[PDB]
Structures are given as C-alpha cells and as structure tokens.
C-alpha cells in the first residue's frame, strides 16, 4: 500500500494519506545510476495546506502541486524546508512562483546560501538551540540538534501523532549511512534521544526516504549511525 520507487516514474509524485488531514508526498530522483524515493509531508490547516519539504527538484515540485490540486484541491499557503539540501529546498522557486510562502530556520537559509541552493524566503525564529520547539499552525517544529545536518528539523502533527523525521531518520531497509558529508556523526545519537524524549507518544514515524514505521526507526537510525561511526 505505501508507494515505492517502482510505482513512481521519475518526474511524478504520489500522495499517501496517513491520517485525517495528514499525507506524505513521495517522489523519486536518479543519482549515480540508482533511483531513490523521497518523502515530504502535507498537513491540513483549516481550509489551507502546509507543505513540509519540496519533492526534490523543480519538475517534481511542479508535479507535486499539480497532484495536490488534483487530489486534495486546497491551496498550499505555506511550506517549511527541514534542512538546506536539494531534496528539501530544490523546488522552492516553483513554490514561490505559485504563491506559496516558503519558510526555513536562519541556520537552513545561511547554509543553502553558502551551498548555492534555493533559499526559502521567510525565517523561522526560535529554533537555534538543541531541543527548541515552536508551533507552526497544525504542527510543532523541533530542532533536536545536529544529526544528518547541523540545521535539521523534525515535524510533529499533534492531532494525528505523526512524527516526520526527515533525513535525520532512516527507514528500516537502510542499513548503511547515506549522505553524511554534512552530518554531525558525534551528535546524531544525542539528537535522536531528544526526539525520543519529546515525542514518546508518536504512532507514525516517516523517514526522509522510504517506508514509514513507528518509533523503532529512531533506534534503528541510532544503530546505523553508530556502526558507521565505528567503520
Ligand atoms: C542521500 N543519501 S545518499 O546519497 O547517500 C543515497 C543515495 C542512494 C541511496 C541511498 C542513499 C542522498 C540524497 C538525498 N538524501 C540523502 C540522505 O538523506 O541520506
Ligand atoms: Zn540532506
Ligand atoms: Zn535526504
Ligand atoms: Zn534496525
């Protein structure tokens, strides 16, 4: 039932309803001969939508909005990018052109800028210290500390007990560490323990890539990060 790399042609996006007024969005990119999916979130906020992360590039992000319009038919008024890499900010100019207000932390905006990536317009304050949490309409935004990147945020939907981990959380199938060029391997497990301490009631955990699960994904990520650290 959860869409996989197979049932999604590159350039297209699938939505997956997780709970009443929570969906994931799933896209794919080709990187080094392989094809890899990517997840974002969509959270209903009254009669508008909050988008978490792009669908990894301009074409995919245009397809995502077409697919939202087609299947949900409420407007995307704001978007949050959970860190500065392309699978999170790539497509932000597309969103912006469609009248979506794009948000990230100052930390994410600086890094995107340093990186030459697209830079979300609006700044999320109050997330600069580990364990910082802020409300953003129908979600809580949480900075656990450095992990996959120094700026990574996680997103919780209090009304549905959905934790969106982004690239700080690995799917079960992933048993080796991925893109760790920008990671803080030393702090990653501590950062996951903050997530665990703050959201012990989460029922659905959505990794940045691949299949959803439960809070077991945090422990799994911990295990993989520690093994990589000891290579
Ligand atoms: C990655 N990680 S990755 O380049 O190591 C990769 C590639 C193919 C299959 C698995 C992992 C790459 C792009 C975006 N995100 C990630 C990630 O979050 O680890
Ligand atoms: Zn990343
Ligand atoms: Zn990623
Ligand atoms: Zn595991």
């Amino acid at each position: 039932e959860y869409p996989t790399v197979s049932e999604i042609p590159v350039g297209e996006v699938r939505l997956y309803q997780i709970a009443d007024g929570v969906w994931s969005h799933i896209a794919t990119q080709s990187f080094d001969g392989a094809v890899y999916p990517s997840n974002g979130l969509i959270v209903r906020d009254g009669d508008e939508l909050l988008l978490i992360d792009t669908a990894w590039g301009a074409k995919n992000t245009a397809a995502l909005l077409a697919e939202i319009e087609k299947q949900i038919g409420l407007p995307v008024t704001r978007a949050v990018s959970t860190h500065f890499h392309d699978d999170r900010v790539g497509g932000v100019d597309v969103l912006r052109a469609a009248g979506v207000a794009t948000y990230a932390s100052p930390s994410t905006r600086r890094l995107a800028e340093v990186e030459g990536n697209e830079i979300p317009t609006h700044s999320l304050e109050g997330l600069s210290s580990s364990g910082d949490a802020v409300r953003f309409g129908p979600v809580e935004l949480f900075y656990p500390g450095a992990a996959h990147s120094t700026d990574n945020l996680v997103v919780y939907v209090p009304s549905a007990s959905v934790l969106y981990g982004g690239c700080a959380i690995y799917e079960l199938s992933r048993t080796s560490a991925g893109n760790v060029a920008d990671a803080d391997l030393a702090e990653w497990p501590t950062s996951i323990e903050r997530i665990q301490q703050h959201y012990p009631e989460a029922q659905f955990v959505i990794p940045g890539h691949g299949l959803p699960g439960g809070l077991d994904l945090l422990k799994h990520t911990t295990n993989v990060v520690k093994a990589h650290t000891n290579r």
Side-chain angles (χ1 to χ4, degrees), residues 1-58 60-231:
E1 200 201 18
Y2 197 84
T4 62
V5 122
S6 79
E7 44 267 15
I8 299 156
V10 136
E12 305 164 20
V13 173
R14 302 279 169 271
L15 314 186
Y16 179 84
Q17 192 139 48
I18 300 152
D20 190 11
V22 187
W23 303 256
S24 60
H25 63 81
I26 306 89
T28 55
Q29 275 293 352
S30 304
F31 200 90
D32 279 0
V35 302
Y36 196 46
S38 198
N39 293 321
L41 217 62
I42 308 167
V43 189
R44 180 174 186 170
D45 181 17
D47 294 333
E48 297 172 348
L49 295 178
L50 169 63
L51 170 60
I52 315 297
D53 294 321
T54 68
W56 202 351
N60 285 357
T61 306
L64 167 64
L65 292 164
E67 189 68 359
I68 291 171
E69 191 187 28
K70 208 165 307 200
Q71 286 199 71
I72 306 174
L74 299 164
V76 179
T77 63
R78 302 173 294 182
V80 173
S81 293
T82 54
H83 68 279
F84 73 98
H85 286 157
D86 272 27
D87 55 329
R88 307 301 149 199
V89 299
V92 153
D93 298 357
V94 167
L95 295 183
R96 190 177 298 109
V100 183
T102 56
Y103 291 76
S105 77
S107 178
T108 294
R109 295 179 75 260
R110 172 190 310 118
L111 284 159
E113 200 212 59
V114 167
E115 203 68 5
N117 291 345
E118 304 172 63
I119 304 166
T121 295
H122 289 266
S123 290
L124 296 160
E125 298 309 324
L127 287 162
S128 60
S129 177
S130 298
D132 280 352
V134 314
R135 202 257 259 240
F136 197 75
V139 300
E140 185 173 81
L141 301 172
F142 185 72
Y143 176 52
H148 169 84
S149 64
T150 61
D151 61 324
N152 43 211
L153 301 178
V154 306
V155 182
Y156 189 62
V157 195
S159 65
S161 325
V162 184
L163 183 66
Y164 174 74
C167 306
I169 300 177
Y170 287 174
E171 78 169 311
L172 289 177
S173 289
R174 199 206 281 208
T175 53
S176 76
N179 169 33
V180 299
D182 297 327
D184 196 312
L185 295 170
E187 296 301 324
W188 200 328
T190 300
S191 301
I192 285 162
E193 187 59 11
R194 299 210 192 76
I195 297 167
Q196 180 59 67
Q197 297 321 288
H198 208 89
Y199 301 108
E201 79 279 16
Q203 292 308 300
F204 309 79
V205 182
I206 306 169
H209 308 267
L211 300 181
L215 284 161
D216 279 10
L217 305 198
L218 304 218
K219 182 47 156 172
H220 168 78
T221 306
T222 297
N223 299 340
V224 177
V225 167
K226 288 184 170 204
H228 187 262
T229 295
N230 293 344
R231 59 197 189 281

